[PDB]
């Protein structure tokens, strides 16, 4: 019934999607070293 996050953003927007990992020095250091890459599954609609 309510909007999903990021819904309605034009796919041609000049804005940026930012992925932030806090405590990346620090508590998430091992996880980020073990990280391979980042994948975004973006579902959008055409009208």
């Amino acid at each position: 019934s309510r909007y999903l996050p990021f819904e309605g953003i034009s796919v041609n927007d000049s804005g940026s999607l930012t992925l932030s990992f806090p405590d990346a020095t620090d508590r998430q250091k091992a996880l980020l070293e073990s990280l391979s890459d980042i994948i975004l599954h973006i579902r959008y609609t055409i009208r």
Binding site: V11, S16, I38, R43, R47
Partner: protein, 147 residues
């Protein structure tokens, strides 16, 4: 008091309709519902007519949109950048082994600000418009994002 609340609801519903149709120019709550000639009466009937007009335009311009999925791998996207590119995994390992780092252009960037790592991807640099022909629709908007 109730007319004020009701007109607030009508205006926010009109904003919802504008967002749904992606057409900010449509106006249905045209004001003057509370008129001095009738001591405030018929505001309800005026607002009912406006809501009916909104529903009619919504039903007449409703469309079933094409639902597309795009998978964007950040490492490939950063490597394929034309001007300012870098390698995601090696830059991440370097920025972790030494607690500083900043690479890329404004919008397409990998940085280590404070103790928090930030990877920014510009939405237009994904060229999601070119994935499908210029026909089939001009309004292409996100619906959901997963990581």
């Amino acid at each position: 008091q109730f007319f004020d609340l009701t007109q607030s609801f009508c205006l926010m519903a009109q904003e919802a309709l504008r967002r749904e149709l992606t057409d900010n120019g449509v106006t249905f709550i045209r004001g003057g519902a509370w008129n001095g000639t009738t001591a405030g009466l018929m505001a309800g009937e005026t607002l009912l007519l406006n809501l009916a007009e909104m529903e009619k335009v919504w039903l007449e311009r409703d469309e079933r949109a094409l639902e597309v999925t795009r998978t964007v791998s950040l490492a490939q996207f950063y490597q394929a950048l034309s001007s300012d590119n870098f390698n995601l995994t090696e830059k991440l390992t370097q920025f972790l082994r030494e607690g500083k780092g900043n690479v890329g252009a404004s919008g397409n960037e990998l940085k280590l600000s404070n103790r928090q790592i930030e990877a920014s991807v510009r939405l237009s640099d994904l060229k999601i418009f070119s994935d499908y022909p210029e026909s089939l629709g001009n309004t292409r908007q996100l619906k959901q994002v997963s990581v």
